[PDB]
């Protein structure tokens, strides 16, 4: 082993893409590695930005966009160093940004 508690945390601005990535990781880790509790939903940090529509005053009609940022979490009980060797080839997409322990 020599590396217990691989606490990988994945965060993205999309849900179905992050769900696909976590499904792929849970299926690939379902091989050599064991004792991996399932995906951990997180409160999906959210913000709203509001912008006036017209180039001129027209204040009474303004719209607003929203940059959603979904969040999940994984914990790995032990490395099983061959498992990280298999892990080296995952090539996750750019939309999901990783953060391990």
């Amino acid at each position: 082993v020599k590396y217990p508690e691989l606490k990988i945390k994945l965060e993205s601005y999309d849900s179905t893409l992050l769900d696909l990535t976590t499904k792929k990781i849970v299926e690939v880790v379902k091989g050599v590695d064991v004792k991996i509790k399932g995906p951990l939903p997180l409160p999906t940090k959210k913000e709203v930005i509001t912008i006036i529509r017209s180039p001129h005053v027209d204040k009474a009609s303004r719209e607003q966009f929203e940059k959603n940022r979904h969040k999940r979490l994984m914990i790995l009980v032990d490395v099983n160093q061959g498992a990280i060797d298999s892990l080296k080839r995952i090539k996750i997409p750019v939309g999901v940004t990783l953060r391990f322990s």
Partner: protein, 215 residues
């Protein structure tokens, strides 16, 4: 006054055009203002390539610009003389430490993309072609390709003053009100000799039932 038909379905029926992230608001602004420059360079400098759109993909000092153009060879050039040139402007506008690895791929049935058709409208109008017959030829050639209804309208100086003489064209089912519609939208500025001509094209490209989410 109505909303841009692209934005309403964008992010829930259409995948984003530039997927990337960086350190929180430190230089994400820099990356956006940089890759929009690449996008503008593609849509501006090379009219002859009819680039439909560009995909920007950055992750921590790497970039890959997928392109979809009707005619790839003009971007490629003769014996690859133009690809190296265009990639060196991309480099000098992006820096030097970042790999580029551009790719160019022809787009199947390009004539169903509003971008290239609007560009053709701009080229025709700027060339003093009578606007009505150009509209009709472009409309027929687009519709014959097997698509659904079209909406092309043009404002600006229609060969003279009193611009409130604007022509609009609608030729079938194109439901803005339906979110699950798979509609395309574009816009070009046909810089005529008398001012600015804005051409707008709406393309209905079939039903998008059972999509679930973005592609």
């Amino acid at each position: 006054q109505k909303v841009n038909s692209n934005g309403l379905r964008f992010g829930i029926n259409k995948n984003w055009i530039s997927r990337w992230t960086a350190n929180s608001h430190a230089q994400t602004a820099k990356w956006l203002i940089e890759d929009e420059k690449i996008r503008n360079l593609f849509f501006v400098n090379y009219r002859n390539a009819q680039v439909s759109n560009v995909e920007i993909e950055r992750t921590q000092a790497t970039v890959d610009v997928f392109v979809y153009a009707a005619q790839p060879a003009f971007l490629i050039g003769s014996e690859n003389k133009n690809i190296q040139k265009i990639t060196k402007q991309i480099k000098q506008i992006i820096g030097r430490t970042t790999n580029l690895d551009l790719t160019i791929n022809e787009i199947g049935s390009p004539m169903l993309s509003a971008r290239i058709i609007a560009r053709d409208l701009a080229n025709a109008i700027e060339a003093r072609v009578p606007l009505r017959t150009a509209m009709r030829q472009s409309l027929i050639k687009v519709l014959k390709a097997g698509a659904n209804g079209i909406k092309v309208l043009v404002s600006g100086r229609l060969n003279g003053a009193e611009i409130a003489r604007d022509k609009m064209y609608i030729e079938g089912n194109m439901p803005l009100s339906t979110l699950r519609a798979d509609i395309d939208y574009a816009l070009e500025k046909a810089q005529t000799t008398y001012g600015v001509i804005g051409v707008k094209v709406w393309i209905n490209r079939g039903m998008i039932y059972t999509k679930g989410l973005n592609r």
